[PDB]
Amino acid sequence: ATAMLGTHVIWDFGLQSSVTLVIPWISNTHYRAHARDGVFDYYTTGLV
Amino acid sequence: GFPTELKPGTNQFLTTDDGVSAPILPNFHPTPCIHIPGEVRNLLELCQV
Amino acid sequence: GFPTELKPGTNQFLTTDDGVSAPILPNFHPTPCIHIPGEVRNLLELCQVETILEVNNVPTNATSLMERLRFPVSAQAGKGELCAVFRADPGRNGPWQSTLLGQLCGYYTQWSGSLEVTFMFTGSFMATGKMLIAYTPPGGPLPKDRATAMLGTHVIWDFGLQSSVTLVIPWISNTHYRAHARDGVFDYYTTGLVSIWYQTNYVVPIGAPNTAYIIALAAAQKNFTMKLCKDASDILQTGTIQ
Amino acid sequence: GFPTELKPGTNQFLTTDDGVSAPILPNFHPTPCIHIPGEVRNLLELCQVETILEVNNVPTNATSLMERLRFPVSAQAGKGELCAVFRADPGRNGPWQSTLLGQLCGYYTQWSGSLEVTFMFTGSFMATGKMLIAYTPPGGPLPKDRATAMLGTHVIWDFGLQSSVTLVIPWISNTHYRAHARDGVFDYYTTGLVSIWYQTNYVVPIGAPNTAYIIALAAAQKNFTMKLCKDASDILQTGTIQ
Amino acid sequence: SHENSNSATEGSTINYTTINYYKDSYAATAGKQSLKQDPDKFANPVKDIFTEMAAPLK
Amino acid sequence: SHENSNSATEGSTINYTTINYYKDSYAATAGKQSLKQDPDKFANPVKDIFTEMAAPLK
Amino acid sequence: GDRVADVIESSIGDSVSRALTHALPAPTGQNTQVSSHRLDTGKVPALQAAEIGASSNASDESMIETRCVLNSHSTAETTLDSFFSRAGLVGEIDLPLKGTTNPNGYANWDIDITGYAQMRRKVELFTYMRFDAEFTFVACTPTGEVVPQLLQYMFVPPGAPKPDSRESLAWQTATNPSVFVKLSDPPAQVSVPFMSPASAYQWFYDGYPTFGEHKQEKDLEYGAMPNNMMGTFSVRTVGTSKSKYPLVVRIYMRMKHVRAWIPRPMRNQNYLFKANPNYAGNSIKPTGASRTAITTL
Amino acid sequence: LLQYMFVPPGAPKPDSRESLAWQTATNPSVFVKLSDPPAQVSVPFMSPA
Amino acid sequence: EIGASSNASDESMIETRCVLNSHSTAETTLDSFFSRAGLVGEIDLPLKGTTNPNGYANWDIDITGYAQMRRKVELFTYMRFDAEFTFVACTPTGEVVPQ
Amino acid sequence: SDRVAQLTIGNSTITTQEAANIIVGYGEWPSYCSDSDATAVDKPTRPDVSVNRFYTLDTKLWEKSSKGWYWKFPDVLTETGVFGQNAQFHYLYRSGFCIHVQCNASKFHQGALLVAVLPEYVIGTVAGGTGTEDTHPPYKQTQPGADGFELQHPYVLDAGIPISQLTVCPHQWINLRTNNCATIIVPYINALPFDSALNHCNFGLLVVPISPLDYDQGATPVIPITITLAPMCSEFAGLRQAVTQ
Ligand SMILES: CCCCCCCCCCCCC/C=C\[C@H](O)[C@H](N)CO
């Protein structure tokens, strides 16, 4: 229920074996540096 | 109230009086009339047979 | 005083008389009418919407009423066995009473038109089968076998991606309108019978149910009309409604 | 005798029937109408004139009735304290009954429109202050504090040369018209609440009263209309008037 | 019709539309009034009119 | 006539033909309605309409 | 002023209701066209897919070989006004002498047409309805007798004072509409407009009339629609002393200038209470007649 | 005071002076007194033929 | 203090949408409000009584005897109009007699 | 090309490879309230994408003995996401809905659900069985919330009306051998241009098995039915503090 409030796709299995999840660029800054634990977690993209 | 005055005859039921009286079935359309042979229009037609 | 003479009818209150009568609230303007979806203009609009036909009108205990909404089919012995039957009379007691068509029909004395019953197969996707559905016009008694049934108006249904099939019950009457048919002389206005037979068989592979259900939906065709507005046969009240 | 037929209604006396009836004085010409100032044409004209709203409807002893005409304000403790509250329902029992608007409102079953209440400060010229006045649309209960009250429609009044300020109570309703609201299911037609809070404080220098009064005047906006003419709830008569 | 002008509202600044069957117009029906209003007469009878946007006293 | 437009069906997409003797139109008779119908609203409210001849699902 | 693209190309605010269907004139039943045999692949009118939610489009012409039939059968009698503009009983009021109910010479009837099943069932076929109405009041003694008695009927809108005695001051009727008529006179009859604050009366309101906690005590108010509460209808014998005869008043309503929206399943269980769809749980009966077997008549 | 009601075939027939059928919500009924002149109405051609 | 009502409109106190108001103002016209018959006089003609046992009665035309009506008219100081009078007679029980 | 479909609105996209077209209730699309139908004068808030998106609120398990369930709108969403919030701070609300009921199985399972929308779905009680008691349904039964509520007497829709005639309401069927979802689009239905999202439920959604679920021993027996819906053309007015009921 919580997960659903975010950007999502509902995949139905069928002849089309695959489905694409787009992870849209949603950032405060124009570029992100590589994110890693610590302050650089600022540049994190998010979760799937 | 538009002024009227009732005259003799009022309320009588004359069996041969050809008048208008309220329709019980509004917007009712009768079954259509197909062709039927032998329609008579006047009794005199029969008085000649 | 302008001379008038009163005629018979004077003072009567005819419930269907369309007249003029004094307005109690002078200069009163009603609340305006905003847009509301789903406006209906004529009851015939509703008579064309399929509602469920309770072909299986046998169970009566509260807990089994949902079962009247569908009838079954299953693997057979290949003898062109009979699956189900019912009278096509829409304004008669029986299966049609479950349909809105039959219900609205009760508010009119006469009707005229073709009818249609669409059957939807709800078995598994692996189940196949061919059924023979037949409308038997007035005069022909309940077909004793599929060979007899076949001489009437019929449709041969093949199960496939199209889950459903439509049986048209064409208007075949001597009179232009039919009054509601019921046992007795009014059986004159009967529409006829519908019979469902196994054309081949209900075949299924290993792993699929041997019994499946069919749901029947019914409505009227576009040549359908009703006449002579009357009160319905049912009055849903026992004592006073409080 | 011209053939007629009498219909239901015949002989009834409908008090609101707008008909013709025989003139008792033939050829009588009335005294001419000279000019008279102040002619009113529509009751709505009067519904736009502010009359005093008895917000302070608590005192009931004869000698204190004049006190209901005004409520007070005085120096506080700076906690955004509550000064007064009342229901915005114009045709409901309460403060509005003192206004002509509320009175005329009683002769109609339904109404629709925005309302306005103008508050006039009658303190000394040296007194200052800022008040927060808020209209709380239906559904929101009486604001427990000024922070809650503030989320609704509001006006922040600053005392100055302009003695008064106007609070508009905009027409915010689900229905196009409201019937008179009263406890029970008709609370459905309630308009909402008005709350008055200290935005800052009533400040005054040495030598000026620490308490002053506010007078509230109320009327209707120009989108205001009334519908369904009815008799008022009050009948100012005990026995026979002799 | 061709009747007497004895109605209480003869010479009124509003046009009424009524029905009658007698030579005297006061016998006529109430009819339909004209829909004009003049609130200002009562709500704003000031000599020097002020604007909404302005400060009433200046 | 010249009456009030207070009938419940004022501003309706169908033309009625009625009789009346009062200034208020709701006093008028039921009259004759217009004979239009729109079954599809209920019988066929699908977005992408399919033909009779076609197979509903493809 | 707008500038960012998404704002310009936004459809936020479109107040036009895109409609997928439209009404067509249909004064008569449809005609039947000639048809001949068809032996084709690909063309399959008989097969449908009910899951879609639409009714079968298969016509007679495509399922059997039809002749031509010019159908002139009228569709006029099934219009809303034809169906509803027929007066029916909606209220009954008793004014007895020595009684338990109204021995005080007057009565107040809260206008509610759901007290009688015939009428109720018809209207409940729709969810929303807008119309004007003609009311007819038929009065007589309990034996169906006519007596020289004078009555007063008064429409008491919500908010107006309700008479509490045969001598209430309310009977002055200075602003309410009242009808004075004798039993000897033909039945009184009047026209009433569409009085709801809503654009339409609604036989079904799935909600509560007020905000708050909806505890057990206030559950009697579930489905209470003030917009349908038009007021009271009060009657009284016109006098200071009690009337010499016991009376009964039957109220008949004939709808006219009718409009309806949102058709629904028709009631199939006996009614038990006014404005409330409660049904006897122990006597839940199937909609119609039943039989012993599906393969027999 | 009497009530006359037209009961088309299929409509419920009153079985008592108090039958619910007398509600006459859809059937046409005429309420008239013996003291009134005779009731009179028009009926259409109703056969299916 | 000026003596005029507030000219402040909704549009200037809050952000408003557009609303096309077609609500009629017809029912609040003087005739709509007043042209509704109401009780103004009651006259008793008893047999054996203290008041009119002589078979007749004189009623000085004054509509201020009944509150409902009186209160409405007194909303104005001056009034000019025509009037329709209706006389409803019966016995004290509301009975009709051949008199 | 009718069996396959994609619904994208807000930041949510739904797919299906076994659809059966789309129903547009009463043949009409959700629209915003016009300046002539409107009555309230305050300028409304139309949050767009933050509330007109797909919320996936519930999952029920279909069993060989299930009776059926119903949910009330907009009751189901009043406590969810940005939509729930607006429904709380505002008195007035109006909107349409796009409903997507999901249920897949296998080519060896069978059964058919009826998915319909019933405007003004007033619930009734069994009146003490005998019918002598005037009982009324509790708040939790009239506005079951997101968990919905199971029908006690599906045949009469717990309201004295034949489920057999329910097809007269916008609907679709999920007949496993054919499709795996129903999609119904609903416009605002009311006699007022706006109303309380709290006190009034414009319509109820019903999901009832008419042809029972069945399959042989060995096939997956857990057959969920999931409810997903998206408000459309959401409008709000009459702002104040938040209120939950
Ligand atoms: C001279 C007085 C005549 C009495 C006038 C009666 C006017 C009544 C208006 C008709 C209103 C239609 C019925 C409305 C709602 C239903 O009866 C129930 N309340 C539904 O719960």
Ligand SMILES: CCCCCCCCCCCCC/C=C\[C@H](O)[C@H](N)CO
């Ligand atoms: C056939 C005779 C009918 C009786 C005719 C009565 C005509 C009366 C004219 C109406 C006058 C309006 C009332 C005038 C004044 C008030 O009642 C009081 N006097 C005010 O103090």
